Design a protein around this ligand. Structure first.
Ligand SMILES: *[C@@H]1O[C@H](CO)[C@@H](O[C@@H]2O[C@H](CO)[C@@H](O)[C@H](O)[C@H]2NC(C)=O)[C@H](O)[C@H]1NC(C)=O
Lengths: 45, 49
């Protein structure tokens, strides 16, 4: 019965979610970079 | 679609967001446009991919 009191810990499970969310947020943000080109949009060029 | 300069592709649907009278369009987390305001009718529309 004392186990519920200690809960109401799971940081190892939240870290897995965070690591993937951070890689997906970074992957999308890397599309707004010019990398030394005139623009960052393949139609505007 | 093109909303006063914003060039893109997607499905237009009725939104439930509320822009501040001076704002034309909104962006989501990760900095991508997700809602616009029609210049002619002044209605807020979501853009789904
Ligand atoms: C832009 O002009 C159009 C003209 O068609 C306006 O649309 C009319 O607006 C009045 C005022 O509410 C309505 O009574 C009419 O029924 C509308 N016309 C149609 C065909 O629906 C529109 O309101 C104007 N927009 C702005 C922001 O001034």
């Amino acid at each position: 019965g004392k186990i519920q009191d200690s809960l109401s810990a799971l940081g190892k499970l939240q870290d897995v979610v965070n690591h993937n969310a951070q890689a997906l947020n970074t992957l999308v943000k890397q599309l707004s970079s010019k990398f030394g080109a005139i623009s960052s949009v393949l139609n505007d060029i | 679609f093109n909303f006063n300069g914003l060039t893109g592709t997607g499905v237009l649907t009725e939104s439930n967001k509320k822009f501040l009278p001076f704002q034309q369009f909104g962006r989501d987390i990760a900095d991508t446009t997700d809602a616009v305001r029609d210049p002619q009718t002044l209605e807020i529309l979501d853009i789904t991919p």
